[PDB]
Amino acid sequence: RGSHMTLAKVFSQKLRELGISSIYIGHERPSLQSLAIKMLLKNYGLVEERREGMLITQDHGIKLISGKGTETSRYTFRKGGKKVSIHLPEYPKMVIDLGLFEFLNEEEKEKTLLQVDLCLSVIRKFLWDGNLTVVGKADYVLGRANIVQSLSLSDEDNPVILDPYGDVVATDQILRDHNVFVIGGIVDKGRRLDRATERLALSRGYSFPRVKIQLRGSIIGVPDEINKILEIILRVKELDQSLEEAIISL
């Protein structure tokens, strides 16, 4: 876990408001982001009760404890507990652009749908469903991700397009400095067409930067799976991982 995960931050803010400094987490993963996910999706919450345990981790100043030891909590995280409201983060936004879907051959379509589904598991590792948007087909359904036919673009979105054949090379800071990431499909020998976003751009005269991810100066060792690209971006932004190490780990 990173020290400053977006979802951990908003959860901890709420817990602090409530004067909660410790939580008995049991068998859960020792990360406020992991707890948030279970609270948002799986019917977990807090139960008021006195426990002791050992300090496992301290995340945004909230002690997460488990087992036995010298620490105390007054709230235990578990199934059927009460939820607390948190301000779910708008950013960052991960956008899968499936405008091109009907131009893909059958192998490409099949890979793509599998990769998209895998993205739901990835997003849940770092953020939550609501930070994932699939665009290009209004019918599909993928957990609680945002599903739209066309791209809706706010004043504050600062998008970059992930493109093996882009002219900008991705750096750590390019990624941290942007808040919306567009990944389209591979259309024959590599280029990644983001069609529904191209449509928006042409229609309003915008131009978004096109960013190629390289390892050691080459687009060689780099995954081209949408779900793997997504995880790289999120390693860097939410875990404060090096781009180099993020790529390695995948």
mmCIF file of C-alpha atoms in Angstrom:
data_model
loop_
_atom_site.group_PDB
_atom_site.id
_atom_site.type_symbol
_atom_site.label_atom_id
_atom_site.label_comp_id
_atom_site.label_asym_id
_atom_site.label_seq_id
_atom_site.Cartn_x
_atom_site.Cartn_y
_atom_site.Cartn_z
ATOM 1 C CA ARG A 1 0.000 0.000 0.000
ATOM 2 C CA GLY A 2 0.975 3.598 -0.524
ATOM 3 C CA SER A 3 0.938 6.118 2.317
ATOM 4 C CA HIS A 4 -1.531 8.398 0.538
ATOM 5 C CA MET A 5 -4.082 6.376 -1.427
ATOM 6 C CA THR A 6 -6.991 8.483 -2.545
ATOM 7 C CA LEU A 7 -9.656 6.189 -1.138
ATOM 8 C CA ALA A 8 -7.791 5.778 2.158
ATOM 9 C CA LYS A 9 -7.640 9.535 2.450
ATOM 10 C CA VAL A 10 -11.421 10.063 2.157
ATOM 11 C CA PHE A 11 -12.151 7.146 4.492
ATOM 12 C CA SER A 12 -9.689 8.376 7.111
ATOM 13 C CA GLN A 13 -11.174 11.887 6.896
ATOM 14 C CA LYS A 14 -14.529 10.511 7.867
ATOM 15 C CA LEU A 15 -13.174 8.337 10.654
ATOM 16 C CA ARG A 16 -11.299 11.334 12.080
ATOM 17 C CA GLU A 17 -14.503 13.413 11.974
ATOM 18 C CA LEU A 18 -16.053 10.651 14.088
ATOM 19 C CA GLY A 19 -13.100 10.579 16.502
ATOM 20 C CA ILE A 20 -12.128 7.034 15.444
ATOM 21 C CA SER A 21 -8.380 6.365 15.635
ATOM 22 C CA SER A 22 -8.344 2.595 15.642
ATOM 23 C CA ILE A 23 -10.216 -0.245 14.131
ATOM 24 C CA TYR A 24 -10.083 -3.978 14.793
ATOM 25 C CA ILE A 25 -9.918 -5.409 11.266
ATOM 26 C CA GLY A 26 -9.717 -9.142 11.957
ATOM 27 C CA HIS A 27 -8.664 -11.071 8.854
ATOM 28 C CA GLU A 28 -9.114 -8.142 6.448
ATOM 29 C CA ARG A 29 -6.271 -6.741 4.443
ATOM 30 C CA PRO A 30 -4.522 -3.987 6.415
ATOM 31 C CA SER A 31 -5.407 -1.063 4.154
ATOM 32 C CA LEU A 32 -8.190 1.531 4.543
ATOM 33 C CA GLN A 33 -8.720 1.184 0.812
ATOM 34 C CA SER A 34 -9.407 -2.542 1.210
ATOM 35 C CA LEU A 35 -11.783 -1.839 4.024
ATOM 36 C CA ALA A 36 -13.527 0.881 2.041
ATOM 37 C CA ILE A 37 -14.068 -1.510 -0.824
ATOM 38 C CA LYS A 38 -15.689 -4.081 1.446
ATOM 39 C CA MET A 39 -17.822 -1.408 3.043
ATOM 40 C CA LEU A 40 -18.968 -0.024 -0.289
ATOM 41 C CA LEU A 41 -19.573 -3.309 -2.105
ATOM 42 C CA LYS A 42 -19.825 -6.302 0.313
ATOM 43 C CA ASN A 43 -22.010 -5.305 3.308
ATOM 44 C CA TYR A 44 -19.222 -4.671 5.856
ATOM 45 C CA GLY A 45 -19.193 -1.894 8.403
ATOM 46 C CA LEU A 46 -18.237 -0.909 11.896
ATOM 47 C CA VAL A 47 -19.426 -2.447 15.124
ATOM 48 C CA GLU A 48 -18.984 -0.632 18.407
ATOM 49 C CA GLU A 49 -17.102 -2.857 20.741
ATOM 50 C CA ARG A 50 -13.966 -2.949 22.779
ATOM 51 C CA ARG A 51 -11.068 -5.109 21.574
ATOM 52 C CA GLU A 52 -7.389 -5.346 22.037
ATOM 53 C CA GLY A 53 -5.017 -6.376 19.328
ATOM 54 C CA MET A 54 -1.643 -5.808 17.880
ATOM 55 C CA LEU A 55 -0.877 -2.899 15.609
ATOM 56 C CA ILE A 56 -0.746 -4.083 12.035
ATOM 57 C CA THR A 57 -0.466 -0.753 10.229
ATOM 58 C CA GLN A 58 -1.302 2.895 10.653
ATOM 59 C CA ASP A 59 -2.988 4.399 7.577
ATOM 60 C CA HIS A 60 -3.625 8.088 7.439
ATOM 61 C CA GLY A 61 -3.294 8.053 11.231
ATOM 62 C CA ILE A 62 -5.863 5.296 11.735
ATOM 63 C CA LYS A 63 -4.465 2.325 13.591
ATOM 64 C CA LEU A 64 -5.522 -1.033 12.130
ATOM 65 C CA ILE A 65 -5.253 -3.751 14.671
ATOM 66 C CA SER A 66 -5.815 -7.426 14.876
ATOM 67 C CA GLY A 67 -5.157 -10.577 16.943
ATOM 68 C CA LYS A 68 -3.923 -9.878 20.471
ATOM 69 C CA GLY A 69 -1.729 -7.197 21.976
ATOM 70 C CA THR A 70 -1.481 -3.905 23.769
ATOM 71 C CA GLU A 71 -3.582 -1.677 21.523
ATOM 72 C CA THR A 72 -7.295 -1.018 22.010
ATOM 73 C CA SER A 73 -10.025 -0.199 19.487
ATOM 74 C CA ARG A 74 -13.663 0.810 20.120
ATOM 75 C CA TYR A 75 -14.834 -0.156 16.621
ATOM 76 C CA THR A 76 -14.519 -3.479 14.858
ATOM 77 C CA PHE A 77 -14.730 -3.808 11.087
ATOM 78 C CA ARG A 78 -16.992 -6.608 9.940
ATOM 79 C CA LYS A 79 -19.818 -8.176 8.041
ATOM 80 C CA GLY A 80 -23.231 -6.610 8.794
ATOM 81 C CA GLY A 81 -21.686 -3.591 10.517
ATOM 82 C CA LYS A 82 -22.889 -0.030 9.894
ATOM 83 C CA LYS A 83 -21.588 1.922 6.939
ATOM 84 C CA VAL A 84 -20.175 5.396 7.158
ATOM 85 C CA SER A 85 -20.589 7.869 4.314
ATOM 86 C CA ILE A 86 -17.449 8.881 2.515
ATOM 87 C CA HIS A 87 -16.906 11.364 -0.256
ATOM 88 C CA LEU A 88 -16.081 9.101 -3.150
ATOM 89 C CA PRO A 89 -13.231 10.558 -5.246
ATOM 90 C CA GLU A 90 -13.974 11.921 -8.734
ATOM 91 C CA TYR A 91 -10.397 11.504 -9.804
ATOM 92 C CA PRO A 92 -8.518 9.925 -11.150
ATOM 93 C CA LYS A 93 -10.648 8.620 -14.035
ATOM 94 C CA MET A 94 -9.739 5.582 -16.030
ATOM 95 C CA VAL A 95 -11.609 5.494 -19.338
ATOM 96 C CA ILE A 96 -11.810 2.464 -21.566
ATOM 97 C CA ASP A 97 -12.724 3.667 -25.056
ATOM 98 C CA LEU A 98 -14.656 0.967 -26.854
ATOM 99 C CA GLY A 99 -15.981 3.229 -29.635
ATOM 100 C CA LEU A 100 -13.905 1.056 -32.019
ATOM 101 C CA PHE A 101 -15.474 -2.270 -30.917
ATOM 102 C CA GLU A 102 -17.279 -3.090 -34.173
ATOM 103 C CA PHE A 103 -14.063 -2.521 -36.194
ATOM 104 C CA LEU A 104 -12.234 -5.300 -34.294
ATOM 105 C CA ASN A 105 -11.828 -8.801 -35.577
ATOM 106 C CA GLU A 106 -13.249 -11.655 -33.499
ATOM 107 C CA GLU A 107 -10.085 -12.549 -31.572
ATOM 108 C CA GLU A 108 -9.585 -8.852 -30.752
ATOM 109 C CA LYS A 109 -13.204 -8.461 -29.589
ATOM 110 C CA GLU A 110 -12.864 -11.477 -27.307
ATOM 111 C CA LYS A 111 -9.556 -10.424 -25.739
ATOM 112 C CA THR A 112 -10.899 -6.935 -25.307
ATOM 113 C CA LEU A 113 -14.010 -8.037 -23.414
ATOM 114 C CA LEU A 114 -11.944 -10.238 -21.128
ATOM 115 C CA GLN A 115 -9.485 -7.402 -20.504
ATOM 116 C CA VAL A 116 -12.280 -5.025 -19.733
ATOM 117 C CA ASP A 117 -13.744 -7.382 -17.176
ATOM 118 C CA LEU A 118 -10.304 -7.807 -15.600
ATOM 119 C CA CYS A 119 -10.158 -3.998 -15.270
ATOM 120 C CA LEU A 120 -12.983 -4.216 -12.772
ATOM 121 C CA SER A 121 -10.679 -6.374 -10.546
ATOM 122 C CA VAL A 122 -7.821 -3.970 -11.035
ATOM 123 C CA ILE A 123 -9.859 -0.834 -10.255
ATOM 124 C CA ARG A 124 -11.058 -2.491 -7.071
ATOM 125 C CA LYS A 125 -7.482 -3.042 -5.961
ATOM 126 C CA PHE A 126 -6.690 0.681 -6.043
ATOM 127 C CA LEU A 127 -9.863 2.736 -6.110
ATOM 128 C CA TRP A 128 -13.437 1.660 -6.664
ATOM 129 C CA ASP A 129 -15.804 0.864 -9.540
ATOM 130 C CA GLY A 130 -16.859 4.503 -9.919
ATOM 131 C CA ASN A 131 -13.438 5.572 -11.126
ATOM 132 C CA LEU A 132 -13.781 3.341 -14.117
ATOM 133 C CA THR A 133 -15.679 4.432 -17.206
ATOM 134 C CA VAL A 134 -16.350 2.298 -20.280
ATOM 135 C CA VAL A 135 -17.349 4.189 -23.294
ATOM 136 C CA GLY A 136 -18.583 3.163 -26.639
ATOM 137 C CA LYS A 137 -21.569 0.982 -25.942
ATOM 138 C CA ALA A 138 -24.470 1.877 -23.731
ATOM 139 C CA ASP A 139 -25.789 -1.676 -23.104
ATOM 140 C CA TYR A 140 -22.895 -3.439 -21.298
ATOM 141 C CA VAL A 141 -22.691 -3.895 -17.521
ATOM 142 C CA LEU A 142 -19.619 -4.236 -15.372
ATOM 143 C CA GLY A 143 -20.155 -3.894 -11.644
ATOM 144 C CA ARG A 144 -20.721 -0.268 -10.750
ATOM 145 C CA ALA A 145 -18.474 1.223 -13.370
ATOM 146 C CA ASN A 146 -19.800 4.160 -15.427
ATOM 147 C CA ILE A 147 -21.132 2.960 -18.778
ATOM 148 C CA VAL A 148 -21.782 5.574 -21.447
ATOM 149 C CA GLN A 149 -22.190 5.710 -25.190
ATOM 150 C CA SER A 150 -20.349 8.977 -25.622
ATOM 151 C CA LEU A 151 -17.634 10.768 -23.680
ATOM 152 C CA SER A 152 -18.772 13.457 -21.261
ATOM 153 C CA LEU A 153 -15.901 15.811 -20.478
ATOM 154 C CA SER A 154 -15.787 18.227 -17.572
ATOM 155 C CA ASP A 155 -14.023 21.590 -17.082
ATOM 156 C CA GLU A 156 -11.578 19.876 -14.762
ATOM 157 C CA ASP A 157 -10.720 16.719 -16.684
ATOM 158 C CA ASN A 158 -7.171 16.799 -17.821
ATOM 159 C CA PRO A 159 -6.925 13.744 -20.077
ATOM 160 C CA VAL A 160 -4.108 11.913 -21.690
ATOM 161 C CA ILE A 161 -4.457 9.155 -24.294
ATOM 162 C CA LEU A 162 -2.446 5.984 -23.949
ATOM 163 C CA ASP A 163 -1.064 5.144 -27.336
ATOM 164 C CA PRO A 164 1.905 2.871 -28.238
ATOM 165 C CA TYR A 165 2.427 5.154 -31.210
ATOM 166 C CA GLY A 166 1.932 8.443 -29.368
ATOM 167 C CA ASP A 167 4.719 11.008 -29.652
ATOM 168 C CA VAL A 168 5.083 11.799 -25.944
ATOM 169 C CA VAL A 169 6.967 9.261 -23.823
ATOM 170 C CA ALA A 170 5.338 8.585 -20.475
ATOM 171 C CA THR A 171 7.234 9.696 -17.394
ATOM 172 C CA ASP A 172 6.324 9.450 -13.734
ATOM 173 C CA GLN A 173 5.350 13.088 -13.630
ATOM 174 C CA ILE A 174 3.364 13.130 -16.870
ATOM 175 C CA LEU A 175 1.161 10.538 -15.202
ATOM 176 C CA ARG A 176 0.903 12.180 -11.787
ATOM 177 C CA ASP A 177 0.121 15.472 -13.463
ATOM 178 C CA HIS A 178 -2.908 14.153 -15.320
ATOM 179 C CA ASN A 179 -6.223 13.097 -13.847
ATOM 180 C CA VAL A 180 -8.003 11.249 -16.708
ATOM 181 C CA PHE A 181 -6.510 8.305 -18.696
ATOM 182 C CA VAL A 182 -7.935 7.052 -21.964
ATOM 183 C CA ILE A 183 -7.169 3.526 -23.222
ATOM 184 C CA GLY A 184 -8.780 2.363 -26.473
ATOM 185 C CA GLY A 185 -8.420 -0.895 -28.381
ATOM 186 C CA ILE A 186 -5.651 -2.269 -30.583
ATOM 187 C CA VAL A 187 -6.598 -1.982 -34.189
ATOM 188 C CA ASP A 188 -4.185 -3.953 -36.307
ATOM 189 C CA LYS A 189 -0.465 -4.032 -35.638
ATOM 190 C CA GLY A 190 -0.633 -1.943 -32.504
ATOM 191 C CA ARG A 191 -2.157 1.441 -32.743
ATOM 192 C CA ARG A 192 -4.726 1.997 -30.126
ATOM 193 C CA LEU A 193 -7.692 3.820 -31.475
ATOM 194 C CA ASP A 194 -9.717 5.789 -28.962
ATOM 195 C CA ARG A 195 -12.651 6.351 -31.261
ATOM 196 C CA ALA A 196 -15.349 7.900 -29.015
ATOM 197 C CA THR A 197 -12.800 10.355 -27.670
ATOM 198 C CA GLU A 198 -11.546 11.165 -31.215
ATOM 199 C CA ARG A 199 -15.144 11.919 -32.040
ATOM 200 C CA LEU A 200 -15.429 14.360 -29.130
ATOM 201 C CA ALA A 201 -12.075 15.986 -29.973
ATOM 202 C CA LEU A 202 -12.852 16.525 -33.681
ATOM 203 C CA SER A 203 -16.275 17.835 -32.839
ATOM 204 C CA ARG A 204 -15.045 20.551 -30.439
ATOM 205 C CA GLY A 205 -11.537 21.185 -31.717
ATOM 206 C CA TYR A 206 -9.646 19.576 -28.796
ATOM 207 C CA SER A 207 -6.351 17.782 -28.874
ATOM 208 C CA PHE A 208 -5.245 15.579 -26.019
ATOM 209 C CA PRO A 209 -1.669 14.406 -25.557
ATOM 210 C CA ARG A 210 -0.817 10.935 -26.738
ATOM 211 C CA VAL A 211 1.506 9.101 -24.448
ATOM 212 C CA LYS A 212 3.570 5.974 -25.130
ATOM 213 C CA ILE A 213 4.730 3.897 -22.203
ATOM 214 C CA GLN A 214 8.342 2.638 -22.670
ATOM 215 C CA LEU A 215 10.725 0.479 -20.688
ATOM 216 C CA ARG A 216 14.399 1.377 -21.140
ATOM 217 C CA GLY A 217 13.636 3.627 -24.099
ATOM 218 C CA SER A 218 11.676 0.925 -25.901
ATOM 219 C CA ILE A 219 8.020 0.009 -26.293
ATOM 220 C CA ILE A 220 9.284 -3.562 -25.995
ATOM 221 C CA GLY A 221 8.913 -5.095 -22.519
ATOM 222 C CA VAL A 222 5.538 -3.406 -21.977
ATOM 223 C CA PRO A 223 2.189 -5.204 -21.563
ATOM 224 C CA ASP A 224 -0.462 -4.281 -24.145
ATOM 225 C CA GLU A 225 -3.366 -5.698 -22.166
ATOM 226 C CA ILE A 226 -5.804 -2.923 -21.149
ATOM 227 C CA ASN A 227 -6.076 -4.276 -17.607
ATOM 228 C CA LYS A 228 -2.243 -4.391 -17.318
ATOM 229 C CA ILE A 229 -1.806 -0.837 -18.642
ATOM 230 C CA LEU A 230 -4.494 0.291 -16.170
ATOM 231 C CA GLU A 231 -2.665 -1.346 -13.272
ATOM 232 C CA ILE A 232 0.599 0.346 -14.261
ATOM 233 C CA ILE A 233 -1.033 3.786 -14.196
ATOM 234 C CA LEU A 234 -2.591 3.051 -10.828
ATOM 235 C CA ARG A 235 0.721 1.676 -9.396
ATOM 236 C CA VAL A 236 2.336 4.963 -10.144
ATOM 237 C CA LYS A 237 -0.474 7.263 -9.041
ATOM 238 C CA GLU A 238 -1.843 5.504 -5.969
ATOM 239 C CA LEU A 239 1.134 3.499 -4.742
ATOM 240 C CA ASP A 240 3.757 6.070 -5.633
ATOM 241 C CA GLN A 241 5.539 3.441 -7.587
ATOM 242 C CA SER A 242 8.186 4.133 -10.131
ATOM 243 C CA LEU A 243 6.921 3.752 -13.723
ATOM 244 C CA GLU A 244 9.906 1.486 -14.315
ATOM 245 C CA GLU A 245 8.997 -0.703 -11.319
ATOM 246 C CA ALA A 246 5.301 -0.552 -12.058
ATOM 247 C CA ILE A 247 6.020 -1.922 -15.517
ATOM 248 C CA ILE A 248 8.363 -4.570 -14.095
ATOM 249 C CA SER A 249 5.836 -5.814 -11.559
ATOM 250 C CA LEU A 250 3.414 -6.591 -14.487
#
